[PDB]
Amino acid sequence: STGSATTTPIDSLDDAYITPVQIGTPAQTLNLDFDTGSSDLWVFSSETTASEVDGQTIYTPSKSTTAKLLSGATWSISYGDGSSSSGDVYTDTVSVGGLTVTGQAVESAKKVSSSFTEDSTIDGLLGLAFSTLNTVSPTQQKTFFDNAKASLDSPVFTADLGYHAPGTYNFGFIDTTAYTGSITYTAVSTKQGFWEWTSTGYAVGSGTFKSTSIDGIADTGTTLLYLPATVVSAYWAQVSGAKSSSSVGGYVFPCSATLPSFTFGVGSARIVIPGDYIDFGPISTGSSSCFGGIQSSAGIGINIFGDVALKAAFVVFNGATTPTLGFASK
Numbered sequence: 001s002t003g004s005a006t007t008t009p010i011d012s013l014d015d016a017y018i019t020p021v022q023i024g025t026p027a028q029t030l031n032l033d034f035d036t037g038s039s040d041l042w043v044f045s046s047e048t049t050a051s052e053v054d055g056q057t058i059y060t061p062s063k064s065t066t067a068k069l070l071s072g073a074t075w076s077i078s079y080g081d082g083s084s085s086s087g088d089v090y091t092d093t094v095s096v097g098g099l100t101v102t103g104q105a106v107e108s109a110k111k112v113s114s115s116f117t118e119d120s121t122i123d124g125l126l127g128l129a130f131s132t133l134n135t136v137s138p139t140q141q142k143t144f145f146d147n148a149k150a151s152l153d154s155p156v157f158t159a160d161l162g163y164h165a166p167g168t169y170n171f172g173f174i175d176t177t178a179y180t181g182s183i184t185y186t187a188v189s190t191k192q193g194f195w196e197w198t199s200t201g202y203a204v205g206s207g208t209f210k211s212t213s214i215d216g217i218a219d220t221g222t223t224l225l226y227l228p229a230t231v232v233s234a235y236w237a238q239v240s241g242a243k244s245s246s247s248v249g250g251y252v253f254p255c256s257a258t259l260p261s262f263t264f265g266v267g268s269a270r271i272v273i274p275g276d277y278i279d280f281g282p283i284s285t286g287s288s289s290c291f292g293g294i295q296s297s298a299g300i301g302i303n304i305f306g307d308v309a310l311k312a313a314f315v316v317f318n319g320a321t322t323p324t325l326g327f328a329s330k
Contacts, residue, residue: 001151002172003099007034007161010121013280014307015223017161018121019169022095023106024064030057030123034169035221036159036195036317037304039133039143040077041094042085042107043124044116052112055120061108067092075107075136080222080300083115089136094144096126099171101148105134105141125221128157128317133193145171145319155319159220160330161311163277179314179328184269188323192302194219195317197325199305200267202227204235205260209270216303218310218317218325224280225262225273226297226304235262235294242292248283251292255282262294264309266327273312 007019018031023043030043044053046060061067067090076086087110094104109124116122127134131142149155152172160178161167168178189196194217203209214227232251236242238260242253253259259275278293293308316326 001099001148002153002170003095003097003148004168004170005097006166007169008166009162009164010119012164014161014164014311016122017167017220017307018123019096019126021126023059024061024092025066026064027095028057028059028064030059031121032124032126033122033221034126034128034159035219036128037217037219037221038077038079038125039127039129039131039193040075040107040135041105041124041126041144042075042077042087042109044112045087045108047087048109049111052117054117057123059106059108059124061090061092061106064092066102067106070105070136070139073105073136073139073141077135080304081115083113085109085112085116087111089141096144096171097169099148099152101144104144104147105136107136128220129195130190130193132190145317148172149319157317157319159310159315159317161220161307163274163311167311174316179330181329182269183314183316183326183328184266185316185318185324185326186266188325190323192217195323195325200265202231202265203263203270204238205275207238209263209265211265214264214303216297216305218305218315220307220310222304222306223308224304224306225278225294225308226300226306227294228303229296229298232294232296235260236292244296248289248291250295252283252289253292255288255290257290264305269327271309271313271327271329273309277308277312
C-alpha cells in the first residue's frame with residue numbers, strides 16, 4: 001500500500017504545516033501537524049477542557065463506531081518549545097492520503113497548553129519519530145508509520161515541504177518526479193528516538209564550504225534551523241545590522257536586508273537554503289526588525305534541522321531495519 005497527502009503552511013511565515021487526517025467511522029477529518037521529532041498522535045477532542053478549545057476541529061470518539069477506549073492508558077507530553085498536552089487514549093481507524101491503519105492509538109487531549117489553544121489551525125500532532133519516544137503509559141504505543149510499515153510497498157515516508165506553498169507527505173514510495181538529481185543517503189542513530197544524523201558541514205552565501213560534523217535531528221515539527229553558536233554567528237556576520245537580541249530571544253536583522261543563502265552538507269552532497277527561507281518577518285506588527293530563521297542551538301542540547309532546512313530538500317525517512325535519511329535538491 002501507499003498514501004499521499006498534501007501538507008499546507010498554517011500561515012504566511014510557514015510556522016508549521018497541517019495535513020488532513022481521517023479518524024474514525026464515519027471519518028472525522030482533523031488537520032494535524034506531522035512531527036518527525038515526536039511519537040504521539042494526539043488530537044483536540046470532545047474531552048478537551050472547554051476553555052482550552054478555541055476554533056480547533058475536535059475528535060469525538062463516541063461518534064465513531066470503530067473507536068475503543070484503551071483502558072487505563074494515559075499520556076502526557078512536553079515539547080521543546082515549552083508547550084504540552086495530556087489525556088487518555090482510544091484506538092481507532094486512521095487514514096492518511098488513502099493509507100489506512102486500523103487499531104491506531106489516538107491520544108485524546110483532556111488538557112492542552114496555551115500555545116495549542118491559541119493556534120486554531122492545528123487540531124493535533126501526528127508523530128513520526130521512533131516509537132520508543134511514545135508517551136502512553138503503562139503500555140507504550142506505536143506511531144502511525146510504525147503500524148503501517150509492514151503493509152507499505154517500501155518502508156519509507158517522504159517529506160516535501162513547500163516554501164510559502166503546499167507540499168506533500170508520501171508513505172510507501174519515493175516519487176522520482178519530485179526532486180532533481182540524486183538522493184544522497186546518510187546514516188541515522190535512533191539512540192535518542194529521533195531521526196538523528198550528521199551533516200558534513202556548511203557554507204554561508206557564496207563562501208567556501210567548511211567541512212565539520214554537525215550532529216542533529218530532522219524535525220518537521222520545528223519551524224527553524226537550530227545550529228551551533230559558531231555556525232550561526234558566521235551566518236549572521238554576513239548580514240549588516242544583524243545581532244542577537246536577548247530581549248527578543250534570538251538573532252534579528254534589519255527587514256531591509258537581503259539575506260544570504262545557507263548550504264548544509266549531506267555526505268558529499270549539498271543542500272542550499274535560499275536566503276528568503278531564512279526571513280521570518282517583523283518581530284511584531286509594523287517593526288523594521290525581522291526575526292531570523294537560523295538560530296543557536298546552545299542550551300537546547302541538540303541541533304535541529306527544522307522546516308527552514310527541510311523545505312529546501314526532498315527528504316526520505318527510510319524506516320528499513322537499519323534506518324537512514326535521504327536528501328535531494330528539488
